[PDB]
Design an enzyme around this catalytic site. Structure first.
Site, PDB file in Angstrom:
ATOM      1  N   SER A  47       0.792  -1.225   0.000  1.00 53.46           N
ATOM      2  CA  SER A  47       0.000   0.000   0.000  1.00 53.46           C
ATOM      3  C   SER A  47       0.827   1.280   0.000  1.00 53.46           C
ATOM      4  CB  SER A  47      -0.948   0.006   1.200  1.00 53.46           C
ATOM      5  OG  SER A  47      -1.763  -1.153   1.201  1.00 53.46           O
ATOM      6  N   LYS A  50       0.219   3.504  -2.978  1.00 59.08           N
ATOM      7  CA  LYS A  50      -0.908   4.430  -3.043  1.00 59.08           C
ATOM      8  C   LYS A  50      -0.449   5.872  -3.239  1.00 59.08           C
ATOM      9  CE  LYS A  50      -4.548   1.830  -0.700  1.00 59.08           C
ATOM     10  NZ  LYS A  50      -3.802   0.544  -0.581  1.00 59.08           N
ATOM     11  N   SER A  95      -5.953   2.684   3.992  1.00 58.53           N
ATOM     12  CA  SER A  95      -5.353   1.772   3.018  1.00 58.53           C
ATOM     13  C   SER A  95      -6.412   0.925   2.312  1.00 58.53           C
ATOM     14  CB  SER A  95      -4.292   0.889   3.679  1.00 58.53           C
ATOM     15  OG  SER A  95      -3.187   1.664   4.109  1.00 58.53           O
ATOM     16  N   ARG A 227       5.654  -0.635  13.309  1.00 56.24           N
ATOM     17  CA  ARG A 227       6.264   0.160  12.249  1.00 56.24           C
ATOM     18  C   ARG A 227       6.447   1.603  12.698  1.00 56.24           C
ATOM     19  NH1 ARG A 227       2.109  -1.211   7.499  1.00 56.24           N
ATOM     20  NH2 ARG A 227       0.767  -0.559   9.242  1.00 56.24           N
TER      21      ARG A 227
HETATM   22  C1  LIG Z   1      -8.705  -6.345  -1.974  1.00 52.63           C
HETATM   23  C2  LIG Z   1      -7.575  -6.811  -2.806  1.00 52.63           C
HETATM   24  O1  LIG Z   1      -6.727  -7.615  -1.974  1.00 52.63           O
HETATM   25  C3  LIG Z   1      -5.599  -8.160  -2.529  1.00 52.63           C
HETATM   26  C4  LIG Z   1      -5.423  -8.327  -3.892  1.00 52.63           C
HETATM   27  C5  LIG Z   1      -4.259  -8.910  -4.359  1.00 52.63           C
HETATM   28  C6  LIG Z   1      -3.293  -9.344  -3.478  1.00 52.63           C
HETATM   29  C7  LIG Z   1      -3.460  -9.179  -2.113  1.00 52.63           C
HETATM   30  C8  LIG Z   1      -4.617  -8.577  -1.630  1.00 52.63           C
HETATM   31  N1  LIG Z   1      -4.790  -8.292  -0.263  1.00 52.63           N
HETATM   32  C9  LIG Z   1      -4.286  -9.286   0.686  1.00 52.63           C
HETATM   33  C10 LIG Z   1      -4.771  -8.976   2.095  1.00 52.63           C
HETATM   34  N2  LIG Z   1      -4.438  -7.599   2.474  1.00 52.63           N
HETATM   35  C11 LIG Z   1      -4.116  -7.245   3.739  1.00 52.63           C
HETATM   36  N3  LIG Z   1      -3.802  -8.227   4.588  1.00 52.63           N
HETATM   37  C12 LIG Z   1      -3.576  -7.778   5.824  1.00 52.63           C
HETATM   38  N4  LIG Z   1      -3.610  -6.523   6.275  1.00 52.63           N
HETATM   39  C13 LIG Z   1      -3.889  -5.640   5.310  1.00 52.63           C
HETATM   40  N5  LIG Z   1      -3.930  -4.334   5.660  1.00 52.63           N
HETATM   41  C14 LIG Z   1      -4.193  -3.255   4.709  1.00 52.63           C
HETATM   42  C15 LIG Z   1      -2.922  -2.436   4.529  1.00 52.63           C
HETATM   43  C16 LIG Z   1      -2.487  -1.850   5.876  1.00 52.63           C
HETATM   44  C17 LIG Z   1      -1.226  -1.030   5.738  1.00 52.63           C
HETATM   45  O2  LIG Z   1      -1.019  -0.297   4.793  1.00 52.63           O
HETATM   46  O3  LIG Z   1      -0.392  -1.199   6.727  1.00 52.63           O
HETATM   47  C18 LIG Z   1      -2.301  -2.979   6.898  1.00 52.63           C
HETATM   48  C19 LIG Z   1      -3.561  -3.834   6.986  1.00 52.63           C
HETATM   49  N6  LIG Z   1      -4.156  -5.934   4.028  1.00 52.63           N
HETATM   50  C20 LIG Z   1      -4.853  -6.598   1.489  1.00 52.63           C
HETATM   51  C21 LIG Z   1      -4.341  -6.953   0.115  1.00 52.63           C
END
Ligand SMILES: CCOc1ccccc1N1CCN(c2ncnc(N3CCC(C(=O)O)CC3)n2)CC1
Ligand SMILES: CCOc1ccccc1N1CCN(c2ncnc(N3CCC(C(=O)O)CC3)n2)CC1
Ligand SMILES: [Cl-]
Ligand SMILES: [Cl-]
Lengths: 242, 242
Positions: A47, A50, A95, A227
């Site tokens: 993320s 972004k 995020s 973090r």
């Molecule tokens: C919808 C599309 O999904 C996918 C597509 C393609 C690949 C992966 C994803 N997934 C996987 C799961 N994911 C995830 N997991 C755990 N924590 C978090 N988080 C958001 C980011 C936060 C940050 O920025 O720290 C932390 C928590 N995200 C989001 C992305």
């Protein structure tokens, strides 16, 4: 230019952790890290992508401005804050991947690739799905490459309008008081091992800017707040924040 | 469109104080205040005038951007933070009057008046000294007129480049955490005897923004912290901040 300060590793070990912090003193043009190898190791941005994603979407009118409301698609996902309407400010803060997946699909693989090359962003490779490459495709960026990209953004030198850069810098706002301002972006890479937690951004002082790029191994989601905690402890030690 | 709430006066009397707090809910287009008459009584803006003054200086090119350095003239003044070099960010944060007096001389009487008229700012009157009229001249503005002005700034509606407006809103950043962002400007009217402290701005939340303008009687400098404190106690009663 660069200088290795091994002493910051204590902030990682006392928290049962391992990673890298990279700082850049803008006035003095000097950099610091606890681990220069890992500082130059390229990972999936997750993320943290972004930041460039918003800049591309805004320069292309995919996003009109920071208050445009992109509403929920009715699909309940596993993070409560995602299941609601969002604007640029809130989608970045929480995020909200589905919102930026929609931006990515509207940007298109062609314009995405050309813009990342113009940004000199990491390995400039978007191979994979246009709406998931930063999470499980081919893009790779290191901590020092994040700082290089952030320094151009801070100075409005990226190859987009000044307006896009000001808006994204607004959306990066994370924390501010009478001592400092932090503009930053978190990230969590889970699809490729090892799992990696990112925090990148900078600290604005009255008469200096300290850019930082951090990543660390993060096996589960329960240590994500480490973090900011570890990064802040390094900032306290270096007398950057009180 | 407007509603009285005398519950808030308890916060004033609690600190042996008197004044007015005006809140504007942007989503609801609805306003609230503890004293409607005072809300519409015009006072010297004092350093809240640094908001319009900055907009005009930027638009006219007197200030190139938020990084340009205004050198300290070497005159030691009573407020220690004034006796150093400043940029737009820090001149706002420390209410550095001498820097803005230089802006006003560069802008000049004719252009200052024309811009204030175009802003519909207060009584639009700059009678007095060109470099001090907001402190002891003829300009006057009410709390509700401040909000009307701030709402235009927030939406980029003033007769200045969107860039000018974006830079001033960045320089207004006062406080930010996971719960809210506060963009505001303090002011202290000392030269006409209804000596008053100002705090005007807004609170950004995820789904809304709350504009606020407050002024209170302020016989000495030691009570200045009550501007933010009373304002925040009101925001915490209305559950606007946690
Ligand atoms: C919808 C599309 O999904 C996918 C597509 C393609 C690949 C992966 C994803 N997934 C996987 C799961 N994911 C995830 N997991 C755990 N924590 C978090 N988080 C958001 C980011 C936060 C940050 O920025 O720290 C932390 C928590 N995200 C989001 C992305
Ligand atoms: C240099 C020209 O001066 C004048 C010229 C013409 C008339 C008055 C002034 N003076 C008066 C003294 N003053 C003052 N006093 C007490 N506190 C503060 N402060 C700054 C504003 C802060 C705030 O914004 O809250 C509070 C502290 N300022 C600045 C303006
Ligand atoms: Cl400076
Ligand atoms: Cl900001």
């Amino acid at each position: 230019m660069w200088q290795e300060n091994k002493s910051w590793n204590a902030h990682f070990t006392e928290h049962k952790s391992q990673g890298v912090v990279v700082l850049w003193n803008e006035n003095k043009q000097q950099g610091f890290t606890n681990n220069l190898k890992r500082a130059n190791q390229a990972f999936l941005p997750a993320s943290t992508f972004k930041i460039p994603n918003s800049l591309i979407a805004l320069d292309l009118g995919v996003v009109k401005d920071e208050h445009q409301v992109f509403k929920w698609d009715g699909q309940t996902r596993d993070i409560a804050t995602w299941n609601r309407d969002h604007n640029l400010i809130t989608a970045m803060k929480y995020s909200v991947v589905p919102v930026y997946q929609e931006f990515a699909r509207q940007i298109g693989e062609a314009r995405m690739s050309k813009m990342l090359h113009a940004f000199d962003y990491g390995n400039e490779d978007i191979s994979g799905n246009v709406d998931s490459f930063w999470l499980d495709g081919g893009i790779r960026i290191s901590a020092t490459e994040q700082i290089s990209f952030l320094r151009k953004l801070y100075h409005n030198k990226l190859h987009v309008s000044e307006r896009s850069q000001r808006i994204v810098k607004q959306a990066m706002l994370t924390e501010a008081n009478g001592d400092y301002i932090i503009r930053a972006k978190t990230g969590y890479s889970t699809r490729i091992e090892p799992k990696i937690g990112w925090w990148v951004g900078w600290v604005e002082l009255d008469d200096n800017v300290w850019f930082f790029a951090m990543n660390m191994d993060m096996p589960t989601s329960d240590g994500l707040g480490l973090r900011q905690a570890i990064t802040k402890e390094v900032l306290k030690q270096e007398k950057i924040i009180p």
